[PDB]
Design a protein around this ligand. Structure first.
Ligand code: A1IW8
Ligand code: ZN
Length: 109
């Protein structure tokens, strides 16, 4: 009844992005803390599915945090905020999204 933690929206503009129902335990945990070559730390949640994003450029395997996957930058399709990455080219599953937990807002359906 009236769940308040069902949908993830973009924290900057409110664009619909994903659902708690779509969280994916990659390697046995939905949460992965990672850093990029510029040393920036991200708390990443894996989702099977997302919407309202704009995937920019072409996939790269360079420095992928997930063995066997190529990544594309995922922007909020509405406001352009960097929300994470789409992962493709791997196995079980072939694709998923890694989204930056603190750039999303959790709320009712
Ligand atoms: O799986 C990933 C996706 C984002 C990526 N960041 C990156 C930044 C500048 C150059 C190359 C990669 C990273 O390190 N790992
Ligand atoms: Zn946005």
């Amino acid at each position: 009844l009236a769940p308040g933690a069902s949908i993830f929206r973009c924290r900057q503009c409110g664009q619909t992005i994903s659902r708690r129902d779509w969280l994916l335990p990659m390697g046995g945990d939905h949460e992965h803390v990672v850093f990029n070559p510029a040393g920036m730390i991200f708390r990443v949640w894996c989702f099977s599915l997302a919407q309202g994003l704009r995937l920019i450029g072409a996939p790269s395997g360079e420095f992928s945090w997930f063995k066997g996957y190529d990544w594309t930058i995922a922007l909020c399709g509405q406001c352009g905020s960097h929300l994470g990455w789409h992962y493709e080219g791997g196995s079980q599953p072939q694709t998923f999204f890694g989204l930056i937990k603190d750039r999303l807002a959790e709320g009712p359906a």
